[PDB]
PDB file of C-alpha atoms and ligand atoms in Angstrom:
ATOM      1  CA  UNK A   1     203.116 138.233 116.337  1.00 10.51           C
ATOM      2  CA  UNK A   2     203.424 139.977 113.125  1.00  9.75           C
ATOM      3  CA  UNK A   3     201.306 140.547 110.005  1.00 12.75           C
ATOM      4  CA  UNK A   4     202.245 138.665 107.347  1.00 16.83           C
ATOM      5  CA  UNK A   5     204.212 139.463 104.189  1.00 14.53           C
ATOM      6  CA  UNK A   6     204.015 136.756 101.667  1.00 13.80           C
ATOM      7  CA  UNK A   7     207.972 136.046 102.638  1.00 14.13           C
ATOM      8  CA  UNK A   8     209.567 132.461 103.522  1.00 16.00           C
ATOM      9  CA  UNK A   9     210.210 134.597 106.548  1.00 18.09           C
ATOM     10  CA  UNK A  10     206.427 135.652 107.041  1.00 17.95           C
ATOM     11  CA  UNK A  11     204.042 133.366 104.968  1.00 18.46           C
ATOM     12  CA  UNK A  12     200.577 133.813 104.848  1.00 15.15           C
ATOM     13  CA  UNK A  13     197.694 131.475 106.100  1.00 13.23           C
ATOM     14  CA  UNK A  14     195.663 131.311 102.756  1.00 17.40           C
ATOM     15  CA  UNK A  15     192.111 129.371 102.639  1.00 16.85           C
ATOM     16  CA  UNK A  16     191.679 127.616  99.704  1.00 16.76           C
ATOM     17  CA  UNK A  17     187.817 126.323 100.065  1.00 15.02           C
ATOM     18  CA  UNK A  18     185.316 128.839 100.377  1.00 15.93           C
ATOM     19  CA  UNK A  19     183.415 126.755 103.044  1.00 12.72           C
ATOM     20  CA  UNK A  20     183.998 123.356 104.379  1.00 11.19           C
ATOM     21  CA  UNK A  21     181.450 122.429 102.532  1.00 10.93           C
ATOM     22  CA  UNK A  22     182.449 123.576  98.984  1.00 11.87           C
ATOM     23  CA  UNK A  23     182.159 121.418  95.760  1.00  9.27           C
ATOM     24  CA  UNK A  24     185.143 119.924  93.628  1.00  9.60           C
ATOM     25  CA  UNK A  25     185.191 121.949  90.470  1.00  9.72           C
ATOM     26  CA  UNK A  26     188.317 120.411  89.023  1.00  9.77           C
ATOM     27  CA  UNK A  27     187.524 116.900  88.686  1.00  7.89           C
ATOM     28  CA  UNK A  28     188.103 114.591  86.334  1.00  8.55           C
ATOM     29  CA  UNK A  29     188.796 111.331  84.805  1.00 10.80           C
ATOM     30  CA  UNK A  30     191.186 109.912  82.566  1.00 13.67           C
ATOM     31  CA  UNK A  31     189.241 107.054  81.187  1.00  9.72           C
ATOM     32  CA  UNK A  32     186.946 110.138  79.622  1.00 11.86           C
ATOM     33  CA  UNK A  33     189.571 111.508  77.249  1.00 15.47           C
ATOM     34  CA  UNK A  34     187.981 107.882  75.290  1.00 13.76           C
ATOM     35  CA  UNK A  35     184.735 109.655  74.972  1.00 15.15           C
ATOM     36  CA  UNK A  36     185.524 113.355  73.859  1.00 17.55           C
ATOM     37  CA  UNK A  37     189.148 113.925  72.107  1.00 17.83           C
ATOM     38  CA  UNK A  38     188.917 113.406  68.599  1.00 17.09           C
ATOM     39  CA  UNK A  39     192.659 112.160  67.934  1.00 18.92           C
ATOM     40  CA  UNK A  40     194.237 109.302  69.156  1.00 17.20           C
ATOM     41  CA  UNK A  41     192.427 107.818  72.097  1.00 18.19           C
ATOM     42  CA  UNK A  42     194.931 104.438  71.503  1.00 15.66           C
ATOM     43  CA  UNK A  43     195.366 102.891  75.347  1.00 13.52           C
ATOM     44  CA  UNK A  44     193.302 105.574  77.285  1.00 11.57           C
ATOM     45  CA  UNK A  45     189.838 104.389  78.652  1.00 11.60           C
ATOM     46  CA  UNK A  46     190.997 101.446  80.875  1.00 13.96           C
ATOM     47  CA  UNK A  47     192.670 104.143  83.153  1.00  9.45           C
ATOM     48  CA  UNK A  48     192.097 103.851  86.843  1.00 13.65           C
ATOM     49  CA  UNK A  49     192.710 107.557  87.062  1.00 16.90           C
ATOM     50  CA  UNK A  50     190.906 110.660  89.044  1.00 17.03           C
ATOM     51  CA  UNK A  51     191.820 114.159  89.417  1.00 13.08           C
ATOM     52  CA  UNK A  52     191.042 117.511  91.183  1.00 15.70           C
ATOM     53  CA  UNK A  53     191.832 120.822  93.221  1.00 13.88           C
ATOM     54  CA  UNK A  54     192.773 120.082  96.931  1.00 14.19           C
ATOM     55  CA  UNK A  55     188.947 119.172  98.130  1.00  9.48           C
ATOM     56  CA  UNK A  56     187.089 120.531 100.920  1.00 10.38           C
ATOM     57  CA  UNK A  57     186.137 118.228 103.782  1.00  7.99           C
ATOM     58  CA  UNK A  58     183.046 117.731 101.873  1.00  9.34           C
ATOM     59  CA  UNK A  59     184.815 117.163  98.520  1.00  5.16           C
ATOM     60  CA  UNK A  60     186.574 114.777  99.530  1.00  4.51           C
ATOM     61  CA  UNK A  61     183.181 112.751 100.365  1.00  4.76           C
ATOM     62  CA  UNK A  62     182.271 113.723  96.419  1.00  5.17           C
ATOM     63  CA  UNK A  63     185.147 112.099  94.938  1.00  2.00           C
ATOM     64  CA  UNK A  64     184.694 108.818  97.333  1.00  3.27           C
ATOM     65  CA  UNK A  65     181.326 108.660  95.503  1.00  7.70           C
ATOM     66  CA  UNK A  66     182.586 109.381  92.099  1.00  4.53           C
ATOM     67  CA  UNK A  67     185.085 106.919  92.823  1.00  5.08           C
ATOM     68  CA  UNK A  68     182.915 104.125  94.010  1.00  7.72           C
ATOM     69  CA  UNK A  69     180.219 104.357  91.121  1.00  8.69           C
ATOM     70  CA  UNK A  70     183.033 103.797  88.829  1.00  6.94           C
ATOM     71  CA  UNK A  71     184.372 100.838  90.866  1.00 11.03           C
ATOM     72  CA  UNK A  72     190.028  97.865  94.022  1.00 10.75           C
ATOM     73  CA  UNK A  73     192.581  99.994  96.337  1.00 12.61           C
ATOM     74  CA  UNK A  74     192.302 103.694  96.234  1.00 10.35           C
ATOM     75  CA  UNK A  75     195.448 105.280  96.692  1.00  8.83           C
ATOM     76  CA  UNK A  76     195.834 109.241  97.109  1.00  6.22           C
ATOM     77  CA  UNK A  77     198.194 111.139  95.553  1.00  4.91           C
ATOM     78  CA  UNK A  78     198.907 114.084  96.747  1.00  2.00           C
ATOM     79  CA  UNK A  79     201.861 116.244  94.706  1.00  3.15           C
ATOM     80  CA  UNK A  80     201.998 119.514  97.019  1.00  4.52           C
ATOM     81  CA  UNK A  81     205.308 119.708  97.883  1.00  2.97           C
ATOM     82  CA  UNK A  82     203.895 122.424 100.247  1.00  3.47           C
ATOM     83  CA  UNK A  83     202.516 123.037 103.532  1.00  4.94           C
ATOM     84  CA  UNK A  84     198.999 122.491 103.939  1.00  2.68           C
ATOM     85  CA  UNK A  85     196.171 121.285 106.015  1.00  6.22           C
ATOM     86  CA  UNK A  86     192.664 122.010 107.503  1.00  6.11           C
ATOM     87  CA  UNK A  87     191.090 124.317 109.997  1.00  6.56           C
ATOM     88  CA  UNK A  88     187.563 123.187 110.799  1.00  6.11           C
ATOM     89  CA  UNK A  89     187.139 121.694 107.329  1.00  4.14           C
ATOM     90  CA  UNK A  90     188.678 123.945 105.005  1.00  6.97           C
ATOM     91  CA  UNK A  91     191.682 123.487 103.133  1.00  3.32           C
ATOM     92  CA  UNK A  92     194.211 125.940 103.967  1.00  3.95           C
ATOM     93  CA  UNK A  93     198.039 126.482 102.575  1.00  2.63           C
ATOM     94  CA  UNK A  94     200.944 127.960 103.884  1.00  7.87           C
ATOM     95  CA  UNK A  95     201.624 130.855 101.631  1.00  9.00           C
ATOM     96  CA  UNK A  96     204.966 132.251  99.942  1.00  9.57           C
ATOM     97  CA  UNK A  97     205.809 133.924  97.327  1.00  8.77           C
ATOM     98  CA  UNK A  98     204.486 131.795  93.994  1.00  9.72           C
ATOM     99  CA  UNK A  99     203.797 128.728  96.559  1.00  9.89           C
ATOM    100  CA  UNK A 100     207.281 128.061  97.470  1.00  7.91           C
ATOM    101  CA  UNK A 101     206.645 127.683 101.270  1.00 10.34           C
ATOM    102  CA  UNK A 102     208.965 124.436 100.966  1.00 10.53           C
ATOM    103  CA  UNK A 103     211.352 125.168  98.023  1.00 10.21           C
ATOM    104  CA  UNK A 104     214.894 123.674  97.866  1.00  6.94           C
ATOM    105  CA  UNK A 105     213.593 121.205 101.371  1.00  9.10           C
ATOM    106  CA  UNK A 106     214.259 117.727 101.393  1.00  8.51           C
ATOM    107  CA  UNK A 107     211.081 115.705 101.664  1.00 10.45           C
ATOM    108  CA  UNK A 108     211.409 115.376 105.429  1.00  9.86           C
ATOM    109  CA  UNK A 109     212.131 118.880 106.292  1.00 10.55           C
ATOM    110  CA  UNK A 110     208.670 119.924 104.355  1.00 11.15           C
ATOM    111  CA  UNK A 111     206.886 116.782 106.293  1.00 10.90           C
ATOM    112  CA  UNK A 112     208.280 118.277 109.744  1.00 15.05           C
ATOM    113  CA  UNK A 113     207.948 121.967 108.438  1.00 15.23           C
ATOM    114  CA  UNK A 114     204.217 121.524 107.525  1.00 15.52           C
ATOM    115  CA  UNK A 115     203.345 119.111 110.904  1.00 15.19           C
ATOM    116  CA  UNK A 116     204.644 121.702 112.926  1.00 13.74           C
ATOM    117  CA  UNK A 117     202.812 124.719 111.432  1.00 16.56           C
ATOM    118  CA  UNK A 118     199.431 122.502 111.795  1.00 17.46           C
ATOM    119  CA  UNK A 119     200.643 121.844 114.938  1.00 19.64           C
ATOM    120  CA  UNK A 120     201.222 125.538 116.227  1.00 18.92           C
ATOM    121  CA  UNK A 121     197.193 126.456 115.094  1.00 18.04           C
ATOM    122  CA  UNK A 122     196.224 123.300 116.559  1.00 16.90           C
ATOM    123  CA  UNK A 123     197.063 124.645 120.149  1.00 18.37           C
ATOM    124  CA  UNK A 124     195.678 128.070 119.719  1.00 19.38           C
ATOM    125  CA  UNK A 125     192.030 128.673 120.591  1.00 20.56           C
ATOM    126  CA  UNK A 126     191.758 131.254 117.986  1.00 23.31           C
ATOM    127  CA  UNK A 127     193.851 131.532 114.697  1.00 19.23           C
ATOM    128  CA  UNK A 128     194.334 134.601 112.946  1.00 17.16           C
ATOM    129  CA  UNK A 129     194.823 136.620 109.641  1.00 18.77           C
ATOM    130  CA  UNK A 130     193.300 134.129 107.580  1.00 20.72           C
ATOM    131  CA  UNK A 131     193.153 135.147 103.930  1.00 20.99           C
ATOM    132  CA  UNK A 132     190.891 134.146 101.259  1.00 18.38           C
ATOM    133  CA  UNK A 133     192.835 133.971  97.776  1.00 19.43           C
ATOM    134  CA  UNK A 134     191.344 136.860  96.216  1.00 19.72           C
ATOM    135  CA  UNK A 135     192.228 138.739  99.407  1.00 15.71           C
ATOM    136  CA  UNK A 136     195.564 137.182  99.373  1.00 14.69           C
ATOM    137  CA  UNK A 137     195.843 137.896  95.542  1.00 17.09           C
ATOM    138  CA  UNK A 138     195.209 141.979  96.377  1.00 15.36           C
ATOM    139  CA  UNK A 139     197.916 141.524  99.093  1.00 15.33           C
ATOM    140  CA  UNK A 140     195.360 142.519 101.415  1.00 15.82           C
ATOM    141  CA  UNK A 141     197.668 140.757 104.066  1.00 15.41           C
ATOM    142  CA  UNK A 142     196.093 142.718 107.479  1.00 13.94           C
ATOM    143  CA  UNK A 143     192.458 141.953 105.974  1.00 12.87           C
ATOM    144  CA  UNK A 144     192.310 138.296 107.359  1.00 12.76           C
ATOM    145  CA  UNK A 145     189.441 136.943 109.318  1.00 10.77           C
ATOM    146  CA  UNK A 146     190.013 135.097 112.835  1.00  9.03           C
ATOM    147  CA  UNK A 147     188.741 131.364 113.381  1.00 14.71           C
ATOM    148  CA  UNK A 148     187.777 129.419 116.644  1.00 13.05           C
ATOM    149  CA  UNK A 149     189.780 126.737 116.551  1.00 15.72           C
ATOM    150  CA  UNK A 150     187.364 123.011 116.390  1.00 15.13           C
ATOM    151  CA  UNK A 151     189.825 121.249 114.091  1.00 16.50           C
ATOM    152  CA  UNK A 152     193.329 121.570 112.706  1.00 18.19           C
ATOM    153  CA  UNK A 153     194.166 118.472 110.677  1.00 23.62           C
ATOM    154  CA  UNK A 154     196.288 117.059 107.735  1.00 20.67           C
ATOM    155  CA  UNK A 155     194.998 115.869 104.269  1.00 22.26           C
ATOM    156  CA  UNK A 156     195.479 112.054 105.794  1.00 22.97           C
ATOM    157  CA  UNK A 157     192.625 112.525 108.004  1.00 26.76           C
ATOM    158  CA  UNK A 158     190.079 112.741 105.634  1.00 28.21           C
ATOM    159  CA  UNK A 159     191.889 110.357 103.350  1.00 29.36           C
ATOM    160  CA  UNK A 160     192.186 107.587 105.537  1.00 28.76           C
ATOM    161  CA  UNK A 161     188.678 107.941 106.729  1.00 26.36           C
ATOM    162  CA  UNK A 162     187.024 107.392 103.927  1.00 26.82           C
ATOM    163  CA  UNK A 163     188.962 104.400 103.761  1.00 27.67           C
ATOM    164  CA  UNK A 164     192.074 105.233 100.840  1.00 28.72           C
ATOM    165  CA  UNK A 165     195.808 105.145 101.078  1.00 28.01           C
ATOM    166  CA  UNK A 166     197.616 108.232 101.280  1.00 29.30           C
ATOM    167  CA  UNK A 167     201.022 108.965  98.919  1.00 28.80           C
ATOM    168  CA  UNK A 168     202.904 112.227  98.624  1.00 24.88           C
ATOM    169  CA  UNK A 169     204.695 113.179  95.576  1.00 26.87           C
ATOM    170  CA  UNK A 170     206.521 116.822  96.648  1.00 27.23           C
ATOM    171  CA  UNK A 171     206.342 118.655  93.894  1.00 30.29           C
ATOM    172  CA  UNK A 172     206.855 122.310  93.928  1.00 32.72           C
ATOM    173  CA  UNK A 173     204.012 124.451  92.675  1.00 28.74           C
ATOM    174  CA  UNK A 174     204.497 125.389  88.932  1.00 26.36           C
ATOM    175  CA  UNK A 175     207.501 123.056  88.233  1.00 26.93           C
ATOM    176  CA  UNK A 176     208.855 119.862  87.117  1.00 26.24           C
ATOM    177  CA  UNK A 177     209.231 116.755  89.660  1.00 25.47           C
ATOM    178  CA  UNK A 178     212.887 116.710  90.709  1.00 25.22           C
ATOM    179  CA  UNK A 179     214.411 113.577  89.642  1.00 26.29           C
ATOM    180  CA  UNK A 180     213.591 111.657  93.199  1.00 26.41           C
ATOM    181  CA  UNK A 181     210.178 112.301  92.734  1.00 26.68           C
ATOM    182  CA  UNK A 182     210.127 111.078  88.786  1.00 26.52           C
ATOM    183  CA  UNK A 183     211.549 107.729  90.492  1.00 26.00           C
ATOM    184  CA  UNK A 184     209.189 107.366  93.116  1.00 25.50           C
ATOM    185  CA  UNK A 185     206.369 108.066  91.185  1.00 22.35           C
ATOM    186  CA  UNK A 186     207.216 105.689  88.495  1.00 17.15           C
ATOM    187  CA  UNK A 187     207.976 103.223  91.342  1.00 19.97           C
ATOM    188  CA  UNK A 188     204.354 103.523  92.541  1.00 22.27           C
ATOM    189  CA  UNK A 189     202.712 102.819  89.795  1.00 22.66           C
ATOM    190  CA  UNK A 190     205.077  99.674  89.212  1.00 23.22           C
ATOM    191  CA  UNK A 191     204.706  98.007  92.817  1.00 18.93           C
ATOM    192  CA  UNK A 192     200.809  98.616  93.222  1.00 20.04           C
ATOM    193  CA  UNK A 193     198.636  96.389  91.308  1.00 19.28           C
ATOM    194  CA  UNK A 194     197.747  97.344  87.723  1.00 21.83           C
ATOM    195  CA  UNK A 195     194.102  97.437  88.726  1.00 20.73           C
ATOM    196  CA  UNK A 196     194.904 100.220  91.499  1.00 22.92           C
ATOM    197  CA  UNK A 197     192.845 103.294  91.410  1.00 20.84           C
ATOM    198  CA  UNK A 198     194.687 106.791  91.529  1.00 20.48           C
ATOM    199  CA  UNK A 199     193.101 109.714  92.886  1.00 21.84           C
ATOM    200  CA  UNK A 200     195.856 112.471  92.171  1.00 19.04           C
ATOM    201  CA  UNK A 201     195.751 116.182  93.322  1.00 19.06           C
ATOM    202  CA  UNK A 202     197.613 119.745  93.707  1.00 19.04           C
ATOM    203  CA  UNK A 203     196.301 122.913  95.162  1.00 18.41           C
ATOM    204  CA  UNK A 204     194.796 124.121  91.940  1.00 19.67           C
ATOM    205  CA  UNK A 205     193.687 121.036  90.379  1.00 19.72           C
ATOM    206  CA  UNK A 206     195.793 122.273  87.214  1.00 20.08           C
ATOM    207  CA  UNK A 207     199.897 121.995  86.278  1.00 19.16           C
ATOM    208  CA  UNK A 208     200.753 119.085  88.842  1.00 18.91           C
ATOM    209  CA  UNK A 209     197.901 117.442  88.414  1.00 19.71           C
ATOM    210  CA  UNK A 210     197.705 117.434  84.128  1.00 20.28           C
ATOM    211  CA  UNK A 211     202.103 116.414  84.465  1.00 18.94           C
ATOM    212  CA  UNK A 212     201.124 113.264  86.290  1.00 18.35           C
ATOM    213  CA  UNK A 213     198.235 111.991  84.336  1.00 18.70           C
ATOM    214  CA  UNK A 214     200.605 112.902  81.217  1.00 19.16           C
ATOM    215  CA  UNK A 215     203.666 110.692  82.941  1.00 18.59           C
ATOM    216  CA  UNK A 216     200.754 108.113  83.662  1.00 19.28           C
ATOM    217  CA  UNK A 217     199.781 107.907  80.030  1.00 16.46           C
ATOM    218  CA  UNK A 218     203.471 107.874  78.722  1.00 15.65           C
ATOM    219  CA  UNK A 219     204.571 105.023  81.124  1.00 16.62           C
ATOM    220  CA  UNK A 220     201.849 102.662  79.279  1.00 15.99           C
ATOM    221  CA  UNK A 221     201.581 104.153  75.839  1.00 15.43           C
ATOM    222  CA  UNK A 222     204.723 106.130  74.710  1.00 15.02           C
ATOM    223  CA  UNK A 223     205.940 102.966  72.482  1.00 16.75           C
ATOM    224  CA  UNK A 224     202.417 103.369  70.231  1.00 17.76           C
ATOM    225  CA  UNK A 225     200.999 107.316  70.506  1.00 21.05           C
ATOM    226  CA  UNK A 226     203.067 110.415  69.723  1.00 22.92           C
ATOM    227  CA  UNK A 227     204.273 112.817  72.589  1.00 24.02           C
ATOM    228  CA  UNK A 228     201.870 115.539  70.364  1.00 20.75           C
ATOM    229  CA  UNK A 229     199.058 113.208  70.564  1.00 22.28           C
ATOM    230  CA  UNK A 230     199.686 112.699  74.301  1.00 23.47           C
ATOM    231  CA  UNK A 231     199.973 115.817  75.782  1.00 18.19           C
ATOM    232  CA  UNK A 232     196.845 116.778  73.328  1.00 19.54           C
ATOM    233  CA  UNK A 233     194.601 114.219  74.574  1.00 17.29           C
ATOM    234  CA  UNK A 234     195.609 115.184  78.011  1.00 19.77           C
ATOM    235  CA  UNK A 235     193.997 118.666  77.724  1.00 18.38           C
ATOM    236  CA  UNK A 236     190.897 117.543  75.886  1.00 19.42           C
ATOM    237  CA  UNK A 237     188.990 116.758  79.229  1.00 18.23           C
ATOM    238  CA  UNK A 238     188.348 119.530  82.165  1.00 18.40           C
ATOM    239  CA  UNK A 239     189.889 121.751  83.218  1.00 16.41           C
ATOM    240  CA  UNK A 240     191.445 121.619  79.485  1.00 14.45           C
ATOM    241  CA  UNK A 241     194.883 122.177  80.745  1.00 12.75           C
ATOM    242  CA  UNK A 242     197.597 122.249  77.490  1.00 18.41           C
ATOM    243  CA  UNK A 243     201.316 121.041  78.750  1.00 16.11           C
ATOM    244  CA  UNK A 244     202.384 122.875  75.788  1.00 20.59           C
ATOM    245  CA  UNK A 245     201.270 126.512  76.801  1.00 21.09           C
ATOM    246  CA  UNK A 246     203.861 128.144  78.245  1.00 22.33           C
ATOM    247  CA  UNK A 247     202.853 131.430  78.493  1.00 20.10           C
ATOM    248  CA  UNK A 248     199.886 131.462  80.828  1.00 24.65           C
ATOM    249  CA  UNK A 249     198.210 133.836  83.429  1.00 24.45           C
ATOM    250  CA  UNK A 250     201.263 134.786  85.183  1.00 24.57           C
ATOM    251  CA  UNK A 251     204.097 136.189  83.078  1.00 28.58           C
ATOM    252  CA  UNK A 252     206.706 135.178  85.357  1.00 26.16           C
ATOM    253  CA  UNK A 253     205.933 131.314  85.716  1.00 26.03           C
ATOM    254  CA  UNK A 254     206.950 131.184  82.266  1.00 21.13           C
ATOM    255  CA  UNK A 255     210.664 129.714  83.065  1.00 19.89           C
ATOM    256  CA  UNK A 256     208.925 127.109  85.063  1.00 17.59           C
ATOM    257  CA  UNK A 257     206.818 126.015  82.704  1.00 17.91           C
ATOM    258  CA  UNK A 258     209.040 125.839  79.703  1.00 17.45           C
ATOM    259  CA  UNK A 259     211.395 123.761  82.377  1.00 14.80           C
ATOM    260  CA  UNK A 260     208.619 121.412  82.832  1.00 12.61           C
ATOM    261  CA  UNK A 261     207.958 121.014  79.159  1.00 11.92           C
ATOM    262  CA  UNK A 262     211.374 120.315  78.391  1.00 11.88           C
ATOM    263  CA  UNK A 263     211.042 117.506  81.393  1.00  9.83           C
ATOM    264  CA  UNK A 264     208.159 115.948  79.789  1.00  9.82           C
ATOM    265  CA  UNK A 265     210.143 115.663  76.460  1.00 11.83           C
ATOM    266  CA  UNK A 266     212.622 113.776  78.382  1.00 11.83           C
ATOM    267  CA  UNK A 267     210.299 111.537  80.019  1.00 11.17           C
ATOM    268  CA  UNK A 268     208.399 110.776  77.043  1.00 14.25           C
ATOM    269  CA  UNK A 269     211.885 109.355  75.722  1.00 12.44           C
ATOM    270  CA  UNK A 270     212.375 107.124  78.734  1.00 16.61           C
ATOM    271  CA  UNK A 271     208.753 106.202  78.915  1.00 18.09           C
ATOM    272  CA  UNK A 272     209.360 104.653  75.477  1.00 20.02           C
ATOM    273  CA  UNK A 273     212.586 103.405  75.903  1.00 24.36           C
ATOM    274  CA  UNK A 274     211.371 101.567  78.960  1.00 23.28           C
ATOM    275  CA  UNK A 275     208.424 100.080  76.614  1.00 24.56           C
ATOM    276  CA  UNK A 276     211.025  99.028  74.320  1.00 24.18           C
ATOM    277  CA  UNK A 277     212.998  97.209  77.009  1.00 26.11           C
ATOM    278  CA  UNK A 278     214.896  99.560  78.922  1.00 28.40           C
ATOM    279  CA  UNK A 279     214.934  98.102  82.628  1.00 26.40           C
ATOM    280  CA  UNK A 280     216.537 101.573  84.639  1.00 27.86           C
ATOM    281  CA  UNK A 281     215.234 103.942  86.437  1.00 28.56           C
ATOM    282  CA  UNK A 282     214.798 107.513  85.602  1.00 30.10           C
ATOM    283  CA  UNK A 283     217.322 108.978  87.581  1.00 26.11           C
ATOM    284  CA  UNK A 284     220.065 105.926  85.821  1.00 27.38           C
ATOM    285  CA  UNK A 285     218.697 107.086  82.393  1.00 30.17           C
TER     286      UNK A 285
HETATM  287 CL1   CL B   1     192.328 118.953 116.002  1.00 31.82          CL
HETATM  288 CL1   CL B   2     199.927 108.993  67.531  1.00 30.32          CL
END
């Protein structure tokens, strides 16, 4: 065996919930932008629409409730184009460098990349060097605690058991969809029934999360509210994420997220031009 590095060569097992029992603090609704922003609210609060950080095994029985009390199909959207999972109820990621386990992978390859890694701890009777994120943060890589092994599972488990569709959208962390995942998520929302609710989540509850409820909003209202007004309303509602920041904690994500800016001027365009009778895709735009 060997340590791990933070490499695509050696990637880190990195917990995500504290417990298996920890709470969602990254969730939101859509629908809510209605009752705080202060601009344009034009064509927001009949939003099927949830959010949030990559939920604990308990979490995920949080946002069922939240879900129901505002209740229609639930469909899950998950937009981690990396490898992840749980071991005994705690979400856990595989690890590289700026989350790019998966990077430059076709959609399959991640699938069978992640499905085997799950698979590997799943057979062990103890799993090793498991990092917390502040431990990972320090690069405290030989620090990791070891785990008996009850469960190893994938996000679906807990999705389908509490009786929701599961849909992933592989988007690398920090970036823009690539143009087959534009397609297929605009194709989702177009062959599921308007009245279909959306529970959409990253790792972090944060960049992923905040691009699809802004692609969301443009798809139905980019013909009647301003991009500015958009991707403002957006960050009025927790965690108060701003698509137009670009220089955030992290100095070197910078690129990435002046890419993904650029992306959502270019969506905004077909959003409206497909309001105004466009009948393409994005990719044929
Ligand atoms: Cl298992
Ligand atoms: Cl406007």
């Amino acid at each position: 065996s060997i340590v791990c590095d933070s490499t695509i060569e050696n990637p880190c097992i990195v917990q995500d919930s504290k417990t298996q029992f920890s709470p969602v603090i990254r969730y939101r609704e859509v629908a809510s932008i209605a009752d705080v922003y202060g601009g344009n609210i034009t064509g927001i609060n009949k939003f099927h629409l949830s959010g949030s950080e990559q939920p604990s095994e308990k979490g995920w029985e949080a946002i069922a409730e939240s879900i129901s009390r505002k209740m229609k199909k639930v469909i899950v959207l998950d937009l981690r184009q990396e490898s992840h999972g749980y071991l005994n109820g705690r979400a856990i990621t595989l690890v590289s460098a700026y989350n790019w386990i998966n990077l430059g992978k076709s959609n399959s390859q991640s699938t069978l990349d992640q499905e085997n890694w799950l698979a590997g701890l799943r057979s062990r009777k103890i799993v090793n060097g498991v990092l917390t994120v502040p431990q990972y943060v320090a690069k405290q890589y030989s620090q990791g605690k070891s785990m008996v092994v009850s469960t190893v599972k994938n996000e679906e488990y807990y999705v389908y058991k509490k009786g929701f569709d599961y849909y992933r959208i592989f988007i690398s962390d920090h970036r823009a969809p690539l143009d087959s995942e534009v397609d297929a998520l605009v194709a989702l929302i177009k062959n599921n029934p308007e009245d279909t609710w959306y529970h959409v989540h990253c790792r972090g509850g944060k960049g992923r999360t905040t691009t699809v409820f802004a692609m969301f909003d443009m798809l139905k209202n980019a013909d009647k509210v301003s991009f500015e007004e958009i991707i403002a309303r957006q960050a009025s509602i927790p965690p108060f994420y701003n698509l137009m920041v670009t220089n955030r904690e992290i100095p070197e994500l910078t690129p990435y997220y002046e890419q993904r800016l650029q992306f959502l001027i270019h969506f905004y365009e077909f959003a409206r031009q497909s309001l105004m009778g466009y009948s393409g895709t994005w990719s044929e735009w």
